[PDB]
Write a protein that binds this ligand. Structure first.
Ligand SMILES: [Mg+2]
Lengths: 120, 82, 84, 59, 94, 156, 94, 140, 148
């Protein structure tokens, strides 16, 4: 019978080689995930459909910010084959009230708080 | 001596960048044909359709007439652009 | 060629974020700026909501960490007080 | 440019004659070249309804 | 000649299917994306104990808003102006 | 590391040697100056321009007509500047933006000639043997603009 | 006159004669017709690009079905260039 | 016959007006004309996707023709123009190929320039100076 | 459908924008009724909007004819000779205002399929492509395999 898959915990224990490859320090982990649905929930189990709806990833290629916490991570583990997860980067820090209207999420995963649309 | 494309046909392309590098300029003056690359000016239904096909390198089918239906369907005042 | 754009940090689709789409499409010949485009207004609203969610999530996680630290304190100094 | 309408149209939709030498050549590659030229797919003004084909002479 | 018995792709004797380099590359690309997903999921920020109850207030307020919306369902108001405006159908000139 | 000349000892394509950066930048400057002097002296006739308007790119020239498939919230006969010009070209030279040309470089002006609704478009949905038949008539707002001028300035 | 052609508006006969007269007034050697390009000469759909060379310099070239027609069209092109009414001329300033 | 339909003429005409240009009895008989007209409207609705697809295919074919005239393949031209950061779309590129042959020659020369710069960079992999046309204008 | 309908090319009446914009609409005849629910909106339009529209568009003559009518109408006559008759039957003031403004902003050209979203009288500035463009010339114009 086809059932829900229990991912062994060893899969989610990064190695030093993984750290070097993907550029992430085990200490000081990132706070937020940018998650984009890159796969259709069609032809996938209803539980994956429901998890996608819960995470609010109904539209494909639409980034969504999520907490990097154990429960959200469990849901993302359930639907990990349909999504792309990246760490949200804040080169200029968190947006403030003043610059809340000038933000932009660049394809690199950086939320720039000044968007001038002018040459550097 | 490097040229992105041969400059013996059509314009002679010369690419450039502005100092700021935010726009690409292209100087492409047309090339005239050299005088030496020029020559001096020189100084029944079945048989009909076969002759026309041989003349215009087409098949026989197009030279046959069409019916009144198609003839009157054709638009005699087509829209004209430019 | 969206992969090259991604490598350069631009949107994979040139129709995405950038001057080509986010700049005003026109302006009055007098020079007066044109009213904001509907698509640009919607995009700005979406980015504002995204930024506000980012701030909210980060603030909530920071507050949770601070609360957990405070609770661990409470436990530690309590334990010590009833030990003494 | 600066041509009259009819001469310009004639020049644009004129059929050119190309020569292929088949000596020691793969018939498939010869056929690919000939098909492109015959269809006119080598012309920027190409269109299936424009009858923009060209003549190909293979020796 | 060259018949597949019955219906292709379903029976015991199906039409053979072969993976192209294109398909292999596509699958490898998806696998790489998922490996990166594993890496980024392997580094949680808070622990379960640290997260316990850190969104309880917001979640409760959101459900309170939902409950208020559910319980505020009531027939709309009715105005004398709406009823009397129908008399304008026979509004004429002089 | 020498390899005797064989059919596969060297790549089939010719070996290209790009110009050295210093001399090539000098040539860049020379060509840019030449084109700038052409613009100053007005050695051009008709100018065409690839301009990004609405959501599309239009190849445009003075006296051209453009049909934008929507209303622009502009009174008819009103003049506008098309600000997203990707390319401006003449008989002898063309200027390309990266990806957009400068305002000080190009000024394309249009006039809102007409505001109209498109001819009725039929949207028909049908599925056999399901009593599934639906019809809708949609008219899309449109604006015809006439491109009055394409002006370039010596700012290269 | 927008979209109109010089000789569409001003009907002329013997454009070669007009061009010869104009070049004589401008003190330029009489043009020499020269077959720059040709295609399908012996067919029923020939193309002839005939160029007018003065002092071994191309003043204009015109296409045609026959050599005479191509020469006439090249004369028309040369006249347009001399009179400054080329198709790519500066648009009228309104 | 308390209530009878008196508009059936116009109800039939509303359909037959769109079938007058058909062939055979489909342009006269309502029982057939309605079927043919429904099929025609469905085809018209579905043909907009095909119109866009065929427009792009035609533009690609014409761009391929022009790039082959200039010695380049369509993938090379398009990719290298993108790398040069020129965002001309296929419609405009085909229009340029047809009506501005010298501009298209300039664009093809630029594409080949960028292609050769990329080849040189790959061959001399390292921190060698970036190609003059390979530099990317950053936006912020 | 396109094949069952006439078509035209994008065009202007007299190059409407080159020198000056000329409002193509010239006449607007509003047939209205004193009585009849169908023309209530038309009556309100005549009372509250027609004057403002007339002063906004001084180049359009407006003829408001109040006669017994079951279907109030507006006939728009354009400089080019086109006549467009629209029913304002049971249309509110806002609907009538929008319809009239659309007629004012619209040219007299037929509302049919437009073959091209653009129209250029000078499509080429560098020379329309012909097969001999991008083709090099040979010495003495010798065709291939020619001996002399
Ligand atoms: Mg079978």
């Amino acid at each position: 019978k086809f059932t829900r898959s229990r991912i062994p915990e060893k899969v989610f224990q990064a190695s030093p080689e993984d750290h070097e490859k993907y550029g992430g320090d085990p200490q000081n982990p990132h706070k937020l995930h940018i998650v984009t649905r890159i796969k259709s929930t069609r032809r996938r189990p209803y539980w994956e459909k429901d998890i996608i709806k819960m995470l609010g990833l109904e539209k494909a290629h639409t980034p969504q910010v999520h907490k990097n916490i154990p429960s959200v991570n469990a849901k993302l583990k359930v639907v990990k084959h349909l999504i792309r997860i990246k760490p949200l980067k804040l080169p200029q820090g968190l947006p403030a009230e003043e610059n809340m209207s000038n933000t932009c999420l660049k394809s690199t995963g950086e939320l720039v708080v000044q968007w001038h649309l002018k040459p550097v | 001596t490097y040229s992105p494309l041969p400059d013996d046909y059509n314009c002679n392309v010369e690419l450039a960048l502005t100092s700021d590098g935010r726009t690409i300029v292209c100087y492409h003056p047309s090339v005239d044909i050299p005088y030496e690359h020029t020559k001096p000016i020189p100084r029944e239904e079945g048989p009909m359709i076969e002759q026309l096909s041989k003349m215009f390198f087409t098949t026989k089918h197009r030279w046959y007439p069409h019916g009144r239906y198609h003839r009157c369907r054709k638009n005699l005042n087509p829209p004209k652009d430019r | 060629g969206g992969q090259w754009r991604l490598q350069q940090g631009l949107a994979a689709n040139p129709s995405g974020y950038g001057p080509l789409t986010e700049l005003p499409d026109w302006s009055y010949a007098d020079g007066r700026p044109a009213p904001p485009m509907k698509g640009q207004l919607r995009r700005k609203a979406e980015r504002e909501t995204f930024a506000r969610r980012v701030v909210l999530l980060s603030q909530e996680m920071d507050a949770g960490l601070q609360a957990w630290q405070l609770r661990q304190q409470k436990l530690q100094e309590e334990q010590r007080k009833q030990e003494n | 440019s600066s041509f009259s309408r009819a001469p310009q149209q004639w020049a644009t939709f004129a059929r050119i004659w190309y020569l292929l030498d088949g000596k020691m050549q793969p018939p498939g590659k010869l056929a690919a070249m000939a098909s492109i030229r015959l269809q006119g797919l080598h012309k920027p003004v190409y269109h299936a309804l424009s009858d923009c084909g060209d003549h190909v002479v293979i020796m | 000649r060259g018949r597949i018995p019955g219906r292709q792709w379903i029976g015991k004797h199906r039409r053979p299917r072969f993976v192209s380099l294109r398909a292999k590359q596509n699958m490898i690309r998806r696998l790489e994306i998922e490996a990166e997903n594993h890496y980024w999921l392997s580094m949680p920020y808070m622990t379960r104990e640290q997260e316990r109850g850190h969104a309880a207030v917001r979640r409760r307020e959101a459900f309170e808003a939902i409950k208020a919306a559910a319980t505020s369902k009531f027939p709309p108001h009715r105005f004398i102006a709406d009823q009397l405006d129908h008399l304008n159908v026979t509004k004429k000139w002089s | 590391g020498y390899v005797p000349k064989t059919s596969l000892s060297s790549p089939p394509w010719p070996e290209v040697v790009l110009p050295d950066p210093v001399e090539e930048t000098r040539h860049h400057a020379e060509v840019v100056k030449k084109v700038n002097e052409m613009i100053v002296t007005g050695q051009y006739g008709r100018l065409f321009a690839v301009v990004h308007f609405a959501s599309r790119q239009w190849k445009v020239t003075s006296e051209d007509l453009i049909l934008i498939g929507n209303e622009l919230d502009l009174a008819c006969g009103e003049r506008i500047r098309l600000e997203k010009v990707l390319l401006v070209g003449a008989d002898n030279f063309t200027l390309l933006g990266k990806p957009l040309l400068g305002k000080d470089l190009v000024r394309v002006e249009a006039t809102v000639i007409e505001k109209t609704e498109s001819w009725p478009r039929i949207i028909m949905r049908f599925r056999k043997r399901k009593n599934f038949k639906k019809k809708r008539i949609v008219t899309t707002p449109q604006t015809v603009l006439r491109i009055n001028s394409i002006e370039i300035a010596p700012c290269l | 006159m927008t979209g109109k052609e010089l000789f569409e508006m001003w009907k002329i006969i013997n454009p070669m004669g007009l061009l010869v007269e104009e070049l004589k007034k401008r003190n330029v050697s009489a043009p020499e017709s020269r077959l720059t390009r040709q295609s399908g000469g012996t067919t029923a759909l020939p193309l002839y690009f005939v160029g007018l060379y003065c002092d071994k310099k191309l003043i204009a070239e015109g296409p045609g079905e026959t050599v005479l027609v191509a020469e006439e069209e090249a004369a028309r092109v040369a006249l347009r260039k001399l009179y400054g009414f080329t198709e790519n001329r500066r648009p009228w300033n309104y | 016959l308390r209530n009878r339909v008196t508009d059936r003429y116009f109800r039939i005409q509303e359909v037959l007006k769109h079938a007058r240009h058909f062939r055979g009895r489909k342009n006269r008989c309502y029982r057939l004309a309605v079927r043919t007209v429904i099929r025609a409207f469905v085809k018209c609705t579905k043909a907009r996707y095909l119109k866009k697809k065929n427009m792009r295919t035609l533009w690609i074919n014409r761009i391929t023709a022009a790039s082959q005239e200039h010695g380049l393949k369509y993938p090379a031209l398009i990719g290298n123009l993108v790398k040069c950061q020129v965002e001309l779309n296929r419609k405009v590129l085909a229009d340029l190929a047809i009506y501005e042959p010298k501009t298209f020659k300039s664009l093809a020369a630029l594409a080949s320039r960028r292609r050769h710069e990329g080849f040189a960079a790959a061959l001399g992999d390292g921190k060698e100076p970036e190609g003059i046309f390979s530099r990317v204008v950053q936006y912020h | 459908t396109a094949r069952g309908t006439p078509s035209r090319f994008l065009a202007s009446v007299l190059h409407n924008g080159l020198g000056r914009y000329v409002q193509q609409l010239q006449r607007l005849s509003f047939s209205v009724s004193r009585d009849g629910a169908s023309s209530r909106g038309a009556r309100e339009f005549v009372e509250r909007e027609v004057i403002d529209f007339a002063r906004r568009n001084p180049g359009v003559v407006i003829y408001v004819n109040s006669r017994p009518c079951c279907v109030p109408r507006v006939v728009a006559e354009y400089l080019n000779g086109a006549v467009r008759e629209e029913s304002i039957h049971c249309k509110s003031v806002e609907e009538i205002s929008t319809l009239v403004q659309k007629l004012a902003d619209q040219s007299g050209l037929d509302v049919i399929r437009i073959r091209k979203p653009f129209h250029t009288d000078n499509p080429s500035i560098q020379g329309q492509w012909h097969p001999f463009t991008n083709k090099p010339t040979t010495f003495r114009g010798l065709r291939p395999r020619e001996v002399q």
